[PDB]
Design a protein around this ligand. Structure first.
Ligand SMILES: *CCS(=O)(=O)Nc1ccccc1-c1ccc(C(=O)N2CCC(O)(Cn3cnc4c(cnn4C)c3=O)CC2)cc1
Length: 332
């Protein structure tokens, strides 16, 4: 490390896990809140919140690559194929739901939805009658279509496009009977930290087409009502990348941890400084290396989301417990 940052060990076929864990570790406001969870009574192997606390501590203090085996055991993905049969956002949810639940009743209650939860409306509009129905939905991540899309702007256009409900899937309008209708989605809110998965793996082959994403992403036009006080501009924080064919692959994540455009590549135990071009354009696709997930941060939230974490931010009770474990282990 001429980077200051420590890598995670490759201990097994955990695919995207390591890339996702670094992305979460460098969500500093989330890291701090994780450090505050009351894990003192927890059981030292069945607790996912404790096991997340353990990995973050080590990523923050260790000079050697950090292990993840207690973490995987704690949420029960211990088989060759639990990673290959899930999406990256499904793992994230498994992680953030344990943590969110542990935070209930404490001073950090609500941190996870505060950081990751946005709101959208799904609406249905009949074409031959007055009935419209609008219903809100929460999301913690967005899955974007890429097949046939030059870029993120076009994936968003596609995402909010009007879908017809005619002939065979006519819409049931209740007292109005079956009807032709149009349906679509609009954002009401976009959260501070925006997780986008790129739908590159489809039923089971990989799509390697060129798909462009920018360092700065203006999303105002996809919101139902904009706010002149807080515009929906986002800054690219992480690029999770997969290289190779459908079957079998190499996994890296590029991050700019401090949000200043000084980029770093995290390839398991190796971490190196890289160029902006290597982190962004070189993963557009179109050798067969490319992004499958992106993390953007709302510009007006960047300072808070990436607030400096210090050693004092870890309560000593938790530091003592993790130390006693290193010492029990260190006895070979
Ligand atoms: C576990 C990696 S592997 O080396 O074992 N490769 C592998 C081998 C056999 C069968 C499947 C794979 C495989 C499994 C998983 C990925 C992968 O890294 N993913 C899965 C897709 C991903 O979640 C992004 N994504 C999210 N949601 C999606 C889609 C498509 N449609 N939806 C709703 C999508 O692509 C990223 C992580 C690669 C290879």
């Amino acid at each position: 490390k001429h980077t200051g940052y420590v890598g995670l060990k490759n201990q097994g076929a955990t695919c995207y896990m390591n890339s996702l864990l670094q992305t979460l570790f460098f969500t500093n406001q989330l890291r701090k809140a994780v450090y505050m969870m009351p894990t003192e009574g927890d059981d030292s192997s069945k607790s996912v919140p404790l096991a997340l606390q353990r990995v973050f501590y080590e990523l923050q203090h260790s000079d050697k690559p950090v292990g993840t085996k207690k973490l995987t055991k704690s949420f029960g993905w211990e088989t060759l194929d639990s990673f290959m049969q899930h999406d990256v956002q499904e793992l994230c949810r498994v992680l953030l739901d344990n943590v969110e639940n542990k935070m209930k009743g404490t001073c950090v209650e609500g941190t996870i939805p505060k950081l990751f939860r946005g709101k959208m409306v799904s609406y249905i509009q009949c074409k031959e009658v007055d009935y419209r129905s609008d219903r809100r939905e929460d999301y913690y991540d967005i899955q974007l279509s890429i097949k046939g899309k030059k870029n993120i702007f076009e994936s968003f256009v596609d995402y909010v496009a009007v879908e017809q409900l005619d002939g065979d899937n006519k819409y049931d309008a209740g007292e109005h009977g079956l009807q032709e209708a149009e349906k679509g989605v609009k954002f009401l809110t976009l959260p501070p930290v925006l997780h986008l998965q790129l739908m590159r793996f489809m039923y089971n082959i990989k799509i390697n087409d060129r798909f462009e994403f920018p360092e700065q992403l203006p999303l105002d036009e996809f919101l139902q009502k904009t706010d002149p006080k807080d515009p929906a501009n986002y800054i690219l924080h992480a690029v999770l990348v997969h290289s190779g064919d459908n079957h079998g692959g190499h996994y890296v994540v590029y991050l700019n941890p401090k949000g200043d455009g000084k980029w770093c590549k995290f390839d398991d135990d190796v971490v190196s400084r890289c160029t902006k071009e290597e982190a962004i354009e070189h993963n557009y696709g179109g050798h067969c290396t490319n992004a499958y997930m992106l993390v953007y941060i709302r510009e007006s939230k960047l300072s808070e989301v990436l607030q400096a974490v210090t050693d004092h931010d870890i309560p000593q009770q938790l530091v003592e417990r993790l130390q006693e474990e290193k010492r029990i282990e260190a006895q070979k």
